């Protein structure tokens, strides 16, 4: 029994002396329920128990954890409960205790995907159409999709939401941010590792974001990374092991350069998420966000008519926030002026 | 009671009782002052201060600044006998065991005399030259532990 | 009834038988909560709980946080006598394998004590200093904490400067179930640490009236406990020094913080005198945007770009903005530190400076010479892709939830930023115009107070009404050049040079 396969010698492995090598499986949902169930049950058996905690619920909440981990989570809950004496303790343990060592969407949907506009719903339903397309898709194994928007479109939070909605068994987020300061080769490598990780799940979704950014593409030159581009180009073409399937979502700020590099040709589907051109929609967004007073919303409503707005939601919220810090008489006028300058 | 001017008797309890360095004088006084001033006052003043004595002083200079001579002078001046301890730059020589163990060993004796006798009045000075060589890997790690060591280690002075 | 010293008689039934630390107190409570809970309730509660006692806990803090002292204190208080076990950092010294096995053995006896008497109640606490830097030794260490059979009824705490260095396997719940991270001591906390270290001094009549615990705390929140203690130690030397207020000043001439190292006096070298009311408005507007960063929840991330021609007093303005922010984390980034770094290396430094920012709840990072980091050269045009990508990404990067990051950079020329398309990324752009009118220039001269009033009036006569184009930074250099001439032709020189810088 050993934690890592790689450390050990090759000679032993060949059939004969060690014919069979077994790799422990990722914890089963049902299994997770079994390991937790024994400790919980032993607790059940004694009178003291936590009513709020549910076995099924804990199992559904955790996918990644090794066994031990289960005992660990439980143990931490017990310690917190002891602390109570001198959800509950279990919730506090979930909140702190791990240290688990293992898909956070809460980092990519900072702003709730509010229904500012009819366009938002249409882009999401189209995401629904795409997942339905994936579900079977025997004729075409691999799904490629992209979102094209004005900078600050916020298309990426949307892509993340589609990933949450899908709930495929393995979803891994890709970050420009992890890649920063990496060697072009290093950048290729991490990206590669994600690519194989996607292979293990039967039905599966992966996110590529800020591809112009990912590529290191720069407007002057233009200068870009041939190798990064390559990993990127082949992959869309590249096929998952038989059975198991994948959907790739790429968010690109600029459509034409990507089209220009044959990148657009690759994608099965292309989607656009334009910034609102309507003042009333802008108002609806304002109402959803709840930043301005019920008076201010009316004032903005009066101003917008006869005017056209071309501003991103990411950008819009930033704009809103900027207008808000200044004093109340000022906020209406400033926001209007700011909008005017941005236009 | 009070030990004679030639005795080694380690009594405990409360039933007892300017050359040569060219330049570097004001600085010499401030450097002198933070390590020596804390230690010199006899003996209640420190408790009135209620501050634990500093462990070490480090001096960095351009080469040829005669840093080594200054170090020898502080060693001569601080104690009747420090007794002064000098460390070779290599420090880590000997693959077989050794260097780590040795580092702890050179460190250890002053502390042990002190634990046996901790309170007053033994101060032990160990001097370090070519620190850059000293701080690789773990051997660098070992030195750090003795100064910040969980138990005691005060009253030992190191200059680098 | 009570069975003789660990006999073989299995009996069942019930017919048998906080000072001184400063800060971290909530955290101390949590650590107490996970390790102690199994031991503390006597004795059925644990079986009712039914959890095997926790094996070990590990704490990592930035250096000087006085991790060690907390460990010593807890170890003595928890058990009447463990009595404390100390590990040399080398641990394994003597490269013969039997010796290393010995390094293992000291752990081995400890596991054994339970084995002879297992049930209740012998506890030995072993603490390893320098757990980082720990092969065969590591695997081996790993065995003497979990499995094959038992090994519970003892606990081990590990203290280390860096988490990342350490092995992953130990961390998982079991062998090291709980990992504890120590933040730089809280300001209020800093006050308990200063207060308690002072208090031993305080308790005796001798004190310095001018010094104030609260003042010291506001002055440094950065300092780690070891260090704060050191800071108090520093003060003593001055009094002692005097015998063979003052302490605060002396303290300034010796803090050596390692986090306070950046000096604003280094970036606001000639200060600000406002040639124009608009320059004040621009600073105040910057302050308002900072306040904006401070107030906003939905928008915790801020980027502001201020642009003026080189020598326009951009960097200084940025520094002032940083000053008046009172943010718990303020850092300034300059090419100056960076000089000669590999394009990748530059990215590494950036990664470090940005990396600290996220932990801090509210913080501002100032980038001087944004273009320098891109390193644009007009001929060409040549600039470095990795730096640019890093800056664009960093601007659009978000600190983890519950956190705010504020970015200020100064670029002399808008054209570079437009060329990159980086400018679009910034939330805002603020102009920093150099002086264009004569009167305003005269006013700047009055604030600086360099020329005598009559000569200044002559200069005003020579400029009032006319147009000028001098950056403030240039203007001071200019004033200096002109003050080196005889009292007669100090104005002729000033005007000549101004006519050249027009």
Curated annotation (Swiss-Prot), chain A:
Superkingdom: Eukaryota
Binding-site positions, ATP: 111-116, 151-158
Phosphoserine: residues bearing it: 175
Positions annotated to bind Mg(2+): 156
Keyword Transmembrane helix on entry: no
Molecular function in Gene Ontology: ATP binding; ATP hydrolysis activity; ATP-dependent protein disaggregase activity; identical protein binding; ionotropic glutamate receptor binding; metal ion binding; PDZ domain binding; protein kinase binding
GO-annotated biological processes: Golgi to plasma membrane protein transport; intra-Golgi vesicle-mediated transport; intracellular protein transport; positive regulation of protein catabolic process; positive regulation of receptor recycling; potassium ion transport; SNARE complex disassembly
Keywords: Acetylation, ATP-binding, Cytoplasm, Hydrolase, Magnesium, Metal-binding, Nucleotide-binding, Phosphoprotein, Protein transport, Repeat, Transport
GO CC field: cytosol; Golgi stack; midbody; plasma membrane
Compartments (UniProt record): Cytoplasm
Modified how: Phosphorylation at Ser-175 interferes with homohexamerization.
Family designation: Belongs to the AAA ATPase family.
Subunit structure comment from the entry: Homohexamer. Interacts with GABARAP and GABARAPL2. Interacts with GRIA2. Interacts with PLK2, leading to disrupt the interaction with GRIA2. Interacts with MUSK; may regulate MUSK endocytosis and activity. Interacts with CDK16.
Known function: Required for vesicle-mediated transport. Catalyzes the fusion of transport vesicles within the Golgi cisternae. Is also required for transport from the endoplasmic reticulum to the Golgi stack. Seems to function as a fusion protein required for the delivery of cargo proteins to all compartments of the Golgi stack independent of vesicle origin. Interaction with AMPAR subunit GRIA2 leads to influence GRIA2 membrane cycling.
Listed name of the protein: Vesicle-fusing ATPase
Name of the gene: NSF
From-to range in the entire protein, with total length: 372 to 737 of 744
UniProtKB/Swiss-Prot annotation, chain C:
Key word ATP-binding present: yes
Mod. after translation: Phosphorylation at Ser-334 interferes with homohexamerization.
Main location: cytoplasm
Binding-site positions, ATP: 270-275, 310-317
A GO cellular-component term linked to this record: midbody
GO molecular function: ATP binding; ATP hydrolysis activity; ATP-dependent protein disaggregase activity; identical protein binding; ionotropic glutamate receptor binding; metal ion binding; PDZ domain binding; protein kinase binding
EC class of the enzyme, as a word: hydrolase
Entry EC number(s): 3.6.4.6
Cofactor(s) listed: Mg(2+)
Phosphotyrosine: modified positions: 60
Catalysed reaction, written as an equation: ATP + H2O = ADP + phosphate + H(+)
Top-rank taxon, per record: Eukaryota
Annotated binding of Mg(2+), by residue: 315
Cofactor note: Binds 1 Mg(2+) ion per subunit.
Subcellular location: Cytoplasm
Biological process according to GO: Golgi to plasma membrane protein transport; intra-Golgi vesicle-mediated transport; intracellular protein transport; positive regulation of protein catabolic process; positive regulation of receptor recycling; potassium ion transport; SNARE complex disassembly
Modified residues (Phosphoserine): 334
Job description of the protein: Required for vesicle-mediated transport. Catalyzes the fusion of transport vesicles within the Golgi cisternae. Is also required for transport from the endoplasmic reticulum to the Golgi stack. Seems to function as a fusion protein required for the delivery of cargo proteins to all compartments of the Golgi stack independent of vesicle origin. Interaction with AMPAR subunit GRIA2 leads to influence GRIA2 membrane cycling.
Family per record: Belongs to the AAA ATPase family.
Subunit structure: Homohexamer. Interacts with GABARAP and GABARAPL2. Interacts with GRIA2. Interacts with PLK2, leading to disrupt the interaction with GRIA2. Interacts with MUSK; may regulate MUSK endocytosis and activity. Interacts with CDK16.
Name of the protein in question: Vesicle-fusing ATPase
Lineage summary: Eukaryota, Metazoa, Chordata, Craniata, Vertebrata
Full protein segment contained here: 185 to 737 of 744
